[PDB]
Amino acid sequence: LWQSKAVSIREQLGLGDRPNDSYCYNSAKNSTVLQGVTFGGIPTVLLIDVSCFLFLILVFSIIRRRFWDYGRIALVSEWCGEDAIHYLSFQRHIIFLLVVVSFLSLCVILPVNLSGDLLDKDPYSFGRTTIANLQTDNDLLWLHTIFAVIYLFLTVGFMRHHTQSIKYKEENITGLPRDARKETVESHFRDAYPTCEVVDVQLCYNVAKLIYLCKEKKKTEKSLTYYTNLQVKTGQAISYYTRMKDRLLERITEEERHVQDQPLGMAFVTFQEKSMATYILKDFNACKCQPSSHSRELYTSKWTVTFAADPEDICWKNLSIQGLRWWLQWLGINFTLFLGLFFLTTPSIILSTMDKFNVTKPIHALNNPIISQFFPTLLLWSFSALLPSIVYYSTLLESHWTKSGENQIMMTKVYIFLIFMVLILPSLGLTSLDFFFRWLFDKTSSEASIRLECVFLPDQGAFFVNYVIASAFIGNGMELLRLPGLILYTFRMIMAKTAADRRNVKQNQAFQYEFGAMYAWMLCVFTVIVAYSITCPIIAPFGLIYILLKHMVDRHNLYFVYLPAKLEKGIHFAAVNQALAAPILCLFWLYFFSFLRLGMKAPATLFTFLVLLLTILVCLAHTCFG
Numbered sequence: 001l002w003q004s005k006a007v008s009i010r011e012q013l014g015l016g017d018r019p020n021d022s023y024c025y026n027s028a029k030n031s032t033v034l035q036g037v038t039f040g041g042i043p044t045v046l047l048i049d050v051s052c053f054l055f056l057i058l059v060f061s062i063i064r065r066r067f068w069d070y071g072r073i074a075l076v077s078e079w080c081g082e083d084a085i086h087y088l089s090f091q092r093h094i095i096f097l098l099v100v101v102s103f104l105s106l107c108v109i110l111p112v113n114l115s116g117d118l119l120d121k122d123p124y125s126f127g128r129t130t131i132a133n134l135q136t137d138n139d140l141l142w143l144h145t146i147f148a149v150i151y152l153f154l155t156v157g158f159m160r161h162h163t164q165s166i167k168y169k170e171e172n173i174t175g176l177p178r179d180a181r182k183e184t185v186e187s188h189f190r191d192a193y194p195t196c197e198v199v200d201v202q203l204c205y206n207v208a209k210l211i212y213l214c215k216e217k218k219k220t221e222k223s224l225t226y227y228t229n230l231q232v233k234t235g236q237a238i239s240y241y242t243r244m245k246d247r248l249l250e251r252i253t254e255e256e257r258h259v260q261d262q263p264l265g266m267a268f269v270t271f272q273e274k275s276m277a278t279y280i281l282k283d284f285n286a287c288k289c290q291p292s293s294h295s296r297e298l299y300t301s302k303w304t305v306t307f308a309a310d311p312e313d314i315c316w317k318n319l320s321i322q323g324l325r326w327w328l329q330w331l332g333i334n335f336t337l338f339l340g341l342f343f344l345t346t347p348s349i350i351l352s353t354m355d356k357f358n359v360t361k362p363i364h365a366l367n368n369p370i371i372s373q374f375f376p377t378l379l380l381w382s383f384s385a386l387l388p389s390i391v392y393y394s395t396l397l398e399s400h401w402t403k404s405g406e407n408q409i410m411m412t413k414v415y416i417f418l419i420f421m422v423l424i425l426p427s428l429g430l431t432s433l434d435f436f437f438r439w440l441f442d443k444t445s446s447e448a449s450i451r452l453e454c455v456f457l458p459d460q461g462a463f464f465v466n467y468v469i470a471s472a473f474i475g476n477g478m479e480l481l482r483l484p485g486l487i488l489y490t491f492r493m494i495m496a497k498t499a500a501d502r503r504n505v506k507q508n509q510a511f512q513y514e515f516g517a518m519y520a521w522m523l524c525v526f527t528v529i530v531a532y533s534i535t536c537p538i539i540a541p542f543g544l545i546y547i548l549l550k551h552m553v554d555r556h557n558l559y560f561v562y563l564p565a566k567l568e569k570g571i572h573f574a575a576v577n578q579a580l581a582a583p584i585l586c587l588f589w590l591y592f593f594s595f596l597r598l599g600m601k602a603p604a605t606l607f608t609f610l611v612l613l614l615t616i617l618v619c620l621a622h623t624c625f626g
């Protein structure tokens with residue numbers, strides 16, 4: 001039924017014989033590898049992954065209070081926030097959004113798709129459940145679009161409930177406008193900034209950052225050369241201890257002199273300028289930027305004057321040189337990151353199709369689902385767990401000026417890059433590979449009938465259902481275990497030597513919850529779910545289990561482990577924006593597929609284009625106008 005008779009039926013079904021049937025793989029030599037691995041893979045992947053959940057959560061119960069304490073590491077030594085009841089509330093509102101999605105979806109769409117004809121002669125073939133709803137003629141293909149709109153309206157709504165709970169605390173009057181003007185001179189800005197009827201306080205023209213580097217280095221070096229002069233019961237190997245005073249020398253000589261040599265050069269460098277025009281005229285000036293004091297308009301501050309940044313934040317270090325140099329750096333960084341995305345996604349996609357190439361081979365040779373549907377999705381989960389961090393490092397090396405801005409950009413970029421990898425790259429690559437497969441299966445010499453009717457995805461959508469299942473199970477497992485972390489803790493304390501240091505380590509492993517990266521992970525998976533939902537119904541049921549198992553793993557993690565944190569209220573709103581993005585990406589994938597298939601000028605695709613266009617437009621309004 002699932003491993004025995006299973007293959008038998010598929011092996012010998014259709015065999016041409018199309019009095020009227022469309023099947024898809026009708027032109028088959030008995031069978032074709034392009035058919036599909038059993039039920040899609042969902043059976044074997046679920047078992048292998050639910051086993052893994054039940055392994056990882058059985059290697060947590062054992063390690064919680066053992067392994068030093070990487071379980072409760074926060075309930076140990078010196079409730080969880082208000083910026084956590086918000087994250088948990090987002091999670092809850094998404095649980096309910098997806099419960100509704102699941103219900104509606106499953107019911108309506110599973111029936112709609114199952115009433116198909118293509119990919120239907122096969123009994124068990126994830127495909128019958130996906131979009132194998134004929135092409136035209138099936139009027140039901142309109143339903144998909146009308147249900148997609150139900151999903152955007154639903155997510156606008158359920159997210160609004162969430163945003164009617166995250167109380168923007170009447171925050172941002174920061175009378176400190178910035179600038180980006182010409183080098184040289186200062187009091188001329190202490191003339192034009194005055195304009196007329198304006199009460200400035202100060203100016204301060206930004207300079208450089210070599211000093212900043214040395215300082216932090218010297219302070220950390222100081223930490224070393226001071227504290228590590230103890231060792232053999234002295235005071236803040238043995239040969240290293242006898243060279244630690246020379247390393248202390250290094251700090252107090254090289255770096256020290258170096259420090260002072262930077263003030264030597266401070267005045268030399270010149271960049272832009274902040275200004276402390278206080279009161280409320282800030283607005284006036286920021287709005288103007290204009291003419292007023294033309295006497296003092298050599299450089300006309302022909303550069304942006306952009307409110308403030310609040311001294312605490314402004315990464316003085318990264319005031320590169322603005323303009324050209326900064327954006328080129330940005331370009332470089334983002335492009336390397338994109339080529340990396342390509343690399344990872346490629347490996348996983350090709351593992352997944354490394355059987356369905358020669359499309360003339362019998363369905364026998366389709367590779368066990370655990371080398372086409374588990375291993376691929378696990379590698380993608382894995383390489384999509386490095387992305388959170390590589391994106392962080394990238395953000396740093398882009399010289400983002402404002403530090404809060406850097407935090408939010410980190411959130412948005414983890415989102416973009418993750419969404420990308422998973423959803424997008426696989427979708428594009430797989431759909432392209434299927435166009436390819438359907439060329440090579442519908443070669444038939446000059447019959448260029450690459451029936452773009454059955455070109456959905458190589459596995460008919462299973463790659464992503466399996467990514468979601470994988471995620472849910474294995475990932476909630478690994479967020480509960482946080483294996484990489486237990487490993488560090490362990491070793492850090494295996495070489496703790498003294499129990500003083502032990503205490504130190506335990507009193508240190510207690511990261512404040514990063515409600516930035518986590519919002520993003522959750523939302524990348526929510527995006528996969530919603531996007532493929534109306535076009536691969538089964539993903540939602542196996543996705544409510546993701547968010548239900550993440551509300552659960554986070555109500556553990558955000559209490560037992562992970563320290564209380566407080567974030568800019570902006571990070572919660574970026575999440576709401578990203579879920580709205582998920583439903584719009586769903587409408588967009590419905591479009592892409594109704595364009596590959598179903599032509600490009602038929603009612604179906606046109607309806608979905610209309611909605612897509614309108615939605616992108618109203619969204620643009622709320623971005624610009626508001």
Ligand SMILES: CCCCCCCC/C=C\CCCCCCCC(=O)O[C@@H](COC(=O)CCCCCCCCCCCCCCC)COP(=O)([O-])OCC[N+](C)(C)C
Nearest residue numbers: 052059063375379382383385386388478479482483484517
């Ligand atoms: C008590 C101690 C004993 C523990 C026993 C239990 C052992 C496990 C048993 C069961 C669960 C199985 C887990 C497998 C996934 C491993 C990932 C990993 O650990 O690293 C990390 C991710 O990933 C990486 O950083 C490296 C990834 C490289 C690829 C290797 C993947 C393995 C498959 C290769 C196939 C070869 C090619 C196949 C060719 C056909 C995990 O980190 P994280 O959880 O993502 O958390 C950080 C980020 N996050 C929180 C934001 C998400």
